[PDB]
Amino acid sequence: DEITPDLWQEACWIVISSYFDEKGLVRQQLDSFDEFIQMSVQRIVEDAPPIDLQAPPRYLLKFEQIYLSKPTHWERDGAPSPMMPNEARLRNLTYSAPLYVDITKTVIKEGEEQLQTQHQKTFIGKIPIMLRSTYCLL
């Protein structure tokens, strides 16, 4: 119906409790990093111009969807393993995740031989990952 004045003190702190149970305390750090990987990183790759090459054969390197995996650690054996946040603090590692890009390469040459080859998930480096974000392991 209507919140009475004597019941307002319980009512307002219940509302604030629902905010901090849902949003949290460091939500500005996580939301900005989430928009950076989910939206900004994709936007940079699309906005980047295609590569034109000459010297005649012509090459176009079109970029496509970004794939980002869980933060992994490569040992001396070369065997990948999921990096723990505790292991990064202990063994002085960097809490980074691999960044994979999809690239479609199209060759342009005389003779009606425009071949479109595609390389799936090309490794182009690692991106440090904020803890407790949606792209972290936790």
Binding site: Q29, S32, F33, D34, F36, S40, V41, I44, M130
Partner: protein, 144 residues
């Protein structure tokens, strides 16, 4: 930007495409009934009496650039590049987005004439609505 020393505001209006004084003052002065804002734009028109074409306005802008050209067409092309790509990029960077730029530059001077008249209060720098916060999102996107 990319210009060493200052230029009059009626020059860059004539460089943008609108060269007649009726089109320039229709961009700046929205209502011609009040004489006060028409009075303070009078010295600006008198300063730009020398320039009368668009091309000579582009020549005057390019002659004061950071990189001085050699031929007449060289500094005109350079001045057209800074008039289009580095002048108000948020309004638009395209070959035919010049009417929107002059309206914003018309609103540039109209905000300036209102504050000189005291019609609206000057926007202080320490007002925190005039501030933005760069979190980890926009900062990492600037690196990337």
């Amino acid at each position: 930007p990319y210009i060493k020393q200052e230029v009059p505001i009626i020059i860059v209006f004539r460089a943008l495409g609108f060269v007649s004084d009726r089109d320039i003052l229709e961009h700046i002065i929205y209502d011609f009934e009040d004489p006060e804002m028409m009075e303070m734009v009078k010295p600006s028109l008198d300063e730009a009496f020398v320039i009368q074409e668009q091309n000579v306005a582009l020549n005057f802008i390019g002659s004061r650039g950071a990189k001085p050209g050699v031929t007449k067409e060289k500094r005109i092309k350079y001045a057209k590049e800074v008039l289009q790509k580095e002048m108000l990029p948020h309004v638009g960077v395209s070959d035919f987005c010049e009417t929107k730029k002059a309206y914003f530059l018309g609103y540039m001077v109209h905000r300036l004439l209102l504050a000189a008249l005291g019609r609206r209060e000057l926007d202080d720098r320490d007002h925190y609505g005039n501030k933005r916060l760069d979190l980890a999102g926009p900062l990492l996107a600037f690196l990337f």
